[PDB]
Design a protein around this ligand. Structure first.
Ligand SMILES: Nc1ccn([C@@H]2C[C@H](O)[C@@H](CO)O2)c(=O)n1
Ligand SMILES: Nc1ccn([C@@H]2C[C@H](O)[C@@H](CO)O2)c(=O)n1
Ligand SMILES: Nc1ccn([C@H]2C[C@H](O)[C@@H](CO)O2)c(=O)n1
Ligand SMILES: Nc1ccn([C@H]2C[C@H](O)[C@@H](CO)O2)c(=O)n1
Ligand SMILES: [Mg+2]
Ligand SMILES: [Mg+2]
Ligand SMILES: [Mg+2]
Ligand SMILES: [Mg+2]
Lengths: 209, 209, 209, 209
């Protein structure tokens, strides 16, 4: 592409028509609503867990995505590799806000279920989630052709679902819940990045970290 | 204010929590709604009229804002200096869209009223507004015999009001109309620029030109 | 195009590889250099003169660019329509800086020469340019196939040339002068906007106003 | 910190005066130059190693920065925790470009030295660095028996040094090498982010991933 592409002020100022929101705006929108269930995606929503998925790929399938169907990978991923996962600031702020509200907090992930998992502990510890707000992580798995999260959102009566992927937002849509998008960091190993805002949903500002 | 201030990617990626919308999205939101009255502020909403205001300030009050109280200025500004005003593309798109809907187009301005005005003609001609959708400019304000912008919005049953200033949005909200913000161009002489989105209202993307 | 196009943080943070500079950085780069000749383009560099060109087009050739070859247009443009031209802040700052330096200031424009012109006066007055730094505007004209500015930059020994158009920067290149780009405002009627930085030249930050 | 802070187009279009460059532009600047030594900082320059530093801080000093002085941490960090570090694309492109030139690739780190290290292997493997271009990581610093980064750049005749921290740029400048800045990712745990461009140096676009 051109050595010196240049730019112009129409481009510099250009904004995609995205419904951006802040955590404060979300909290304000909920003012006075009693405790309810809310849910969070995990990967690239509350944890930058690319370190573990990157290790998994290099270890289990350097040339493919097969590691994601490998039980030996999931056993490592769910039982300690989140020691290297970096909690997202947007998640600290959202989880603190939902604890303030007295909301029930659920995590619903496309990760595969394993025999044991330490992920619930990592989340409760890192985010300072009290026992009463915390719920064990739901490992909904990944099955092409099905949104495995939708039925879980329904079963737990989740009213807000935060996530980075299109299927997080459409899971919320499927059940009539409010789907709010978090930006996936640009150094995530899960590419391409989704188009945040592509269902006209709210997207949290500065939510890449 | 360092010579080399530098930057960082948090700053570079930072977004204000604005509800950005497009003309297409606004149109979509009105699908199936019958013809209705809509209204526009003039200055920095549909016309970049700073050229006449710049000339007016230079000619009539170079050291103050007194020109805005000078009938000699307004007679000039409302009877031909808009030949030098630059129509905004955002306004061309909105007015085309509303005309296509069969909506009534109103312009409500805080410009001081004059004996005659040719601003209505300028607007109909520049924006190709059909006679059936066109309405003579309304001069609203707080002088004896005048009615306020809010009062005129109620009178004409204006359901959507477009403008760049805080007072355009509040005038709409006070009567329960939908106030939609247009960005004031950075080379406008009316400074400082407003904080578009300051009341949580919709702001049209790229609406500075 | 899509109703809800969305975005992602790689896009939000993306920067074109442009050599951006500030006026302070330019002045610093010149520290200790004795008085020299410098030159400025006029339209969209020091004056937002779109009001006059817009009036000219609508008056003289609503359906074409023929007004730009019409002597009756130029006579109006160069003898008063700049009363509506809005001086650029970047130009105030650059002209003040060159006056500080004791530099000779030239304006070299692609506007056509007329029998009389009041543009030199408008510039000296609006920018507070002292007699000794000021020089009468050079109306170099426009002739496809020739950069009419290059020979003028050579004749006046201009060492820095500021401008918004590609031919301003290449005029400076032609003569071995330092060509520095100003951003053309997005509400200029001269479209399309140039790609600032496309010759790897310095571009002044925030220079659209 | 208003609930609805709004924005304006001056802010939206605002650019810091940074000398942005691309990898293509850097390569172009070296055209015809024979093979030379170039060097890279490691952390947040070529590896997003925050996962290991995050784990290290949690494990060894949750309430302080003491882990960076703890030999037990460094033995872990330099002997396998980089399996969880994420290579930066900007580094893949730069290292490919320099390898293609036949340049010598050096890595100079302020990480504390350890009895053994497998970081050199991680870097050669991840970046596909041929044995003829590869050099074992240099641990530079101010401990007895060590030499500083500046000293190592002189020793190896490193002509270009890439890094994200101020000290990477100053170490280059102190010995007359070309210091080129890479953006630290916003989800790095090393905070605050540096002001890339703080010394007027080149900064690589989009170099946060
Ligand atoms: N420099 C400017 C530009 C626009 N306006 C607005 C638009 C109306 O014409 C006028 C109403 O007083 O003020 C202004 O006050 N000053
Ligand atoms: N959280 C972090 C991340 C990186 N570094 C840098 C990179 C080197 O590994 C180390 C040198 O002390 O510090 C750090 O100090 N702290
Ligand atoms: N590089 C990858 C690939 C997948 N996943 C996540 C998203 C899915 O929900 C789950 C199974 O694919 O793991 C991830 O975080 N990073
Ligand atoms: N819409 C336009 C068209 C032209 N010009 C300028 C640039 C040229 O130098 C000169 C003759 O075209 O006028 C302008 O400012 N605006
Ligand atoms: Mg996810
Ligand atoms: Mg207005
Ligand atoms: Mg010009
Ligand atoms: Mg570093």
């Amino acid at each position: 592409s051109p050595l010196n592409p240049g730019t112009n002020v129409a481009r510099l100022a250009e904004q995609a028509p995205i419904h951006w929101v802040s955590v404060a705006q979300i909290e304000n929108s909920l003012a006075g609503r009693p405790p309810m269930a809310v849910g969070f995606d995990i990967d690239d929503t509350v944890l930058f867990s690319s370190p573990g998925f990157w290790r998994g790929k290099k270890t289990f399938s350097p040339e493919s995505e097969d590691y994601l169907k490998n039980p030996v990978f999931w056993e490592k991923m769910n039982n300690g590799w989140d020691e290297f996962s970096i909690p997202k600031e947007v998640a600290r702020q959202l989880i603190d806000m939902h604890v303030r509200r007295g909301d029930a907090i659920f995590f619903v992930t496309g990760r595969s279920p394993t025999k044991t998992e330490t992920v619930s502990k990592t989340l409760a510890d890192n985010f300072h989630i009290p026992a009463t707000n915390m719920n064990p992580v739901i490992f909904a798995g990944d099955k092409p052709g099905q949104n495995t999260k939708s039925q879980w959102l329904q079963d737990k009566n989740i009213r807000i679902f935060y996530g980075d992927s299109d299927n997080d937002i459409t899971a919320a849509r499927d059940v009539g819940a409010r789907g709010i998008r978090i930006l996936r960091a640009s150094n995530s190993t899960y590419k391409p990045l989704p188009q945040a805002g592509a269902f006209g949903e709210e997207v949290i500002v500065n939510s890449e970290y």
